[PDB]
Amino acid sequence: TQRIASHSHVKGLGLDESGLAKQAASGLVGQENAREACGVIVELIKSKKMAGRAVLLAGPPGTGKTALALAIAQELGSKVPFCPMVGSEVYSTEIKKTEVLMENFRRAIGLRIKETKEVYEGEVTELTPCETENPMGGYGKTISHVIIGLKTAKGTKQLKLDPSIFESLQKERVEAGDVIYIEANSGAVKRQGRCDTYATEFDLEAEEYVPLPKGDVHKKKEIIQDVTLHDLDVANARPQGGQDILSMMGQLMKPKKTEITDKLRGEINKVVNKYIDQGIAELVPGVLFVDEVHMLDIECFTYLHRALESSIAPIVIFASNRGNCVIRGTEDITSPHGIPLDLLDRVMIIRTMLYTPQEMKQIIKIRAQTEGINISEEALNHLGEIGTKTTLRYSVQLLTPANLLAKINGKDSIEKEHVEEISELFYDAKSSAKILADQQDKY
Template identity: 40%
Template sequence: MSNITTKDITNTTSSRNILNGITPHSHIKNLGLKPNSIEPEYFQLNGTSGMVGQIKARKALAIISKMIVKKDVMGKSILLAGAYSTGKTALAKGLAGELNQQILTTINKDGSSEEVQENVVPFVSFSGSEVYSLELSKTETLTQFFRRAIGIRIREVTELICGEVVELIIDRSITGGQKQGKLTIKTTDMETVYELGTKMIDNILKEKINGGDVITIDKANGKITKLGRSLSRSRDYDAMGVDTKFVKCPEGELQQRKTVTHTVSLHDIDVINSRTQGVLALFSGDTGEISKEIRDQIDNKVTEWKEEGKAEIVPGVLFIDECHMLDLECCAFINRALEMELAPIVIMATNRGLTKARGSEDITPHGLPADLLDRCIIVPVEKYEAKDLSMILKIRSTEEEVEINDEGLQLLTKIGQETSLRYSCNLLAVSNQISLKRGAKIVELEDVEKAYLLFLDSTRSIQVLKEEPIVQNNDIEMTE
């Protein structure tokens, strides 16, 4: 197998490409760091991160992620620079997973603990070409993306009634009048009887509340939540459903205060306050231009909430892929936006070297103006080694549910080294269809060979055009 190269392949066949809807980065969950450390670990097939290789870049982003959570890099910008197909977007997605994997442990009123996963930091991504819209100006589009990446965590104190249902009595009128009832509820320290109205009775019937259930009642809106069944009533029935949850009877006062946290973005607040339909404007998608006066009023209100302790500003991450597509006006706007008080962390990615900045004739590094580049912390992204390519292809075969033997995997790795990782991943899917065509369940060497000749990579396609141009320029006659 070591003697086989892409030039030795001679067999051909035909195939259909069936897409299964799996995205190129659907296997990536986080940066894959060691526990309580910023050191990356090499991926194992039974792991959960999905990241392979790029040890230096992953370590650099691990340091950035720690600083982001501690809010030490507000208004900073990071540039991921490297050749195409080296995993820049994958690194950004891994950073997003790293920021959003914090597990918060909450203690319920019944004494039980519950782990809740919360998105700690907002993460917004877009491509540099998305700013060129026919409906919105470039600055308005960038402003909306920037404000989407800034979260507002609003705290609200609600009063709850939490206890075990002792007795529930509902009187239904024969004449069809209003329903009436009484609810006896207790904790380990006290017991109280509440009069029930029609709305509360309907909610109780909807939730199927019975004696022995542990419930919470929101005094503001009357919402009833069933936490489970009391342990003291666990022997009331011989048979219980598998989904039956037993909890302890709550302790202390029946009426308790609970702090509820809502997280929204500044852009959501902008849209709600700038449209007559309010919250429904978020679902219509027609945000349009938002005036500066409305945004200034919202910023002042948010600052006021922050001073009163009602809200907390959570600067997020704005990821701009293909940032070399931004022109001088967009780069100047980003320069100014990074200096504002409410600014997210901007992470940009590009595969350009020395090239012209869009809108200028000047040759600049990575296609960015010198003033914006001077603000960036540049993280180099290196090409994958052979062992990394092989491991990534194994992960993709598992993700796409494709079985491939060792010889086929080695050839795909060789192809990835000579061409690109993206091309090898594409060949993996079509090779699977070729193997299914011949009635096999495992992709073998001959399937990869046939797929390689059926689908050209960019280098071979350019060579074909040089040898046999599709259109000869001298055959075209220009007429007035």
């Protein structure tokens, strides 16, 4: 099955009908203000009325702002795209930071285009050069059309094609019983391979045997393909066709991220505007997520101003676990939360607070029921005392070894002696930090 993820127990925000945040919903307890604020944010995402909006999430480590940001995508669904990106990915050797952020802005937004396809496929029963009778003194023989037979399990059908395609059928190898791909709209003819029925005549043959297609001879089906503006920017960035020698050699070369000029962006915006005016393509906005925003360079902080002031900028969310810190790139400059005041004024700050011991016990119970672990009352109280003493995260991490050791000992439930032995063997971060002080001279 699916491997259990730390955030996999968060299925969404769990909002009510009136907009208020239920206390316990979708495995989330507490943080009513943050869940309601994000509850308005998802209404902005669904509304699509504004662009370039930047939200900020601040608070102590372990408050669940990442669980809320990831819960936003779960509440929105799979219709709108969601692009989490850490600030560490902004620094790259080949591609510049501004091109990284731009390509992320193109990664958020996406398109969906509906298209119909008509395809003829099957085994070839017969191929005839149908000859009409029109003898002329200028040219002796006349051929009106070529008949191509096709056989499938559901039915057989014959097709009357112009003789011009027989020049390609004679240009490439075509044998009786060859399963071929023929599209009516494109008009091109490709050879799939030999049918599996004739594979029994020879013990060894070079041609591979593809099975006969199961279905009607003429297949017309409508499929909607979703392609993001970033994919469009890459396909427009490098040619996919390898007919050219420079495209073949460049295809042999190692692919590297290239800086894309704004002209291609403008052309994409224009053709996208045209298809939107036609109504065939459906455009949906994306949701960009950013974690460890305090790790960005000051050049990225100033670039986010011109990036956010644009109307094509998708909604961006930020996550900052740090307080007042020195801005990276400048030694003597200090700013609250680790972000300059210019961007910090533009972003919408959301405050988060630490959980109470009761909420710690409830979250521990939720994680226990998620991982499928049973906890006794008293051991849950002592574990809540441990989490309150140090952190919620450590008390969450203490669940697995007590479950495994409990199964080894034969007890299907966790006991205070189990969490006591586990708490004795393993060391919390603060206790280890205090132990390092005495032996620091030997280190």
